[PDB]
Design a protein around this ligand. Sequence first.
Ligand SMILES: CC(=O)N[C@@H]1[C@@H](O)[C@H](O[C@@H]2O[C@H](CO)[C@@H](O[C@@H]3O[C@H](CO)[C@@H](O[C@@H]4O[C@H](CO)[C@@H](O[C@@H]5O[C@H](CO)[C@@H](O[C@@H]6O[C@H](CO)[C@@H](O[C@@H]7O[C@H](CO)[C@@H](O)[C@H](O)[C@H]7NC(C)=O)[C@H](O)[C@H]6NC(C)=O)[C@H](O)[C@H]5NC(C)=O)[C@H](O)[C@H]4NC(C)=O)[C@H](O)[C@H]3NC(C)=O)[C@H](O)[C@H]2NC(C)=O)[C@@H](CO)O[C@H]1O
Ligand SMILES: *[C@@H]1O[C@H](CO)[C@@H](O)[C@H](O)[C@H]1NC(C)=O
Length: 377
Amino acid sequence: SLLNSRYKLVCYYTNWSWYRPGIGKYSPEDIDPSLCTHIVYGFAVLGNDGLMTAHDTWSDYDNRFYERVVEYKRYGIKVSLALGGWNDSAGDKYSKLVNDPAARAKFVQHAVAFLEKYGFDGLDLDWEYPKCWQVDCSKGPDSDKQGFADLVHELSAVLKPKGLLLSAAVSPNKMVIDAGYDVPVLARLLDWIAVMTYDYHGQWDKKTGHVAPLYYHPDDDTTYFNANYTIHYWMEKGTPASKIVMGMPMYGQSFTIENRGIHGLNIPVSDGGEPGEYTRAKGFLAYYEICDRIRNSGWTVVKDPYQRMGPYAYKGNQWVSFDDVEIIKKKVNFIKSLNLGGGMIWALDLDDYRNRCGQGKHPLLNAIKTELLNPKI
Ligand SMILES: CC(=O)N[C@@H]1[C@@H](O)[C@H](O[C@@H]2O[C@H](CO)[C@@H](O[C@@H]3O[C@H](CO)[C@@H](O[C@@H]4O[C@H](CO)[C@@H](O[C@@H]5O[C@H](CO)[C@@H](O[C@@H]6O[C@H](CO)[C@@H](O[C@@H]7O[C@H](CO)[C@@H](O)[C@H](O)[C@H]7NC(C)=O)[C@H](O)[C@H]6NC(C)=O)[C@H](O)[C@H]5NC(C)=O)[C@H](O)[C@H]4NC(C)=O)[C@H](O)[C@H]3NC(C)=O)[C@H](O)[C@H]2NC(C)=O)[C@@H](CO)O[C@H]1O
Ligand SMILES: *[C@@H]1O[C@H](CO)[C@@H](O)[C@H](O)[C@H]1NC(C)=O
């Protein structure tokens, strides 16, 4: 059992995975409580009044999704509420919050009251990101860095005496870490730091690449866009290994390549991949969408034999990179070799939780659990 091991397994739950057809539908009651130590609810958002509020009142309040996920505290799981996420981070509203001490002070007392109203064990900060709003470092003032660290302090100072948790999901990008994160404050005050060691590559690159390389690979354009560098950078900036939980994607980045004859790594790309039937977003595919394309639509799989990264798969002008059970066992032995706090997945509902592909229910997340519980490194 994961609850009696030295590792965390932090699972993100997403309230919008309810709005999916057929087998893609995911509800609170689909959470498998033997697969996580911590569940993080994505996402609450920052309202116009500068206070945390439900992103989707229909599901969160009227259909009691908050209460239905906080349910799993009954199995010994810690359930936190995440604030922010990519789409809530598009503007300046978090920056206006953290640069204003009176707004932070109001925000903080209300936030803790919100968490306790619904029974949450903690808060997860997912502002993407201080200074580099949606990764654009020219957007935010440098004082976002100190503002966010002061927010984290002011949150910790009220949460910690109550026994409540404070964590954050943070960029894997060297440039964002340098510009927006006061790493020693974060490392000292957070119960864990969920490093989002994925989305290194995607349609924005105008070229094919892997969503989540583990190690540097010789054809890479940078030495720093891989989990191994990102994890060592966080520790080098001052993070104790035990605070790091390493992010792993349950989904793939998809691309439309510019001609179907070329189909390897780093080949030109005109757009994101075609949207999946269930996730309905150009540019990505859930693992259960990918594994079905491979098993039944004849997509070809190319594994990396050096095992610096997971596979990619292509058909015609469609190309997707993703993690398979093999690279995940490698990532988890890596987690164990560095004595990291544990692993994190984005997200429960993107793994093959219905066993649509014949490898078992939740093949990726079971692979993580099994490797985390295996004593050999
Ligand atoms: C260009 C240049 O000059 N420089 C480049 C750099 O750009 C480049 O850096 C890269 O830059 C890209 C951005 O272009 C970054 O990509 C971002 O990476 C982040 C990770 O650090 C991602 O954020 C985290 O992880 C996940 C993704 O894995 C995030 O998930 C996303 O979350 C949002 C919510 O915030 C989800 O949005 C939900 O979307 C669905 C639609 O799909 C909505 O669904 C609808 O719901 C309503 C009701 O609610 C319903 O009625 C509708 O029917 C329904 N519709 C459908 C179709 O279903 C939801 O409502 C909505 N939810 C909310 C709350 O709004 C989104 O789907 C989800 N995506 C996935 C795949 O799950 C999550 O927020 C983050 N948190 C955590 C804990 O994981 C971010 O996703 C990603 N952005 C994009 C655009 O992909 C790269 O990180 C960055 N890389 C690096 C290394 O920095 C660099 C490097 O390449 O190079 C420079 O030079
Ligand atoms: C991982 O990173 C560290 C420091 O950046 C480096 O010393 C080590 O050799 C890297 N491992 C691989 C396999 O690239």
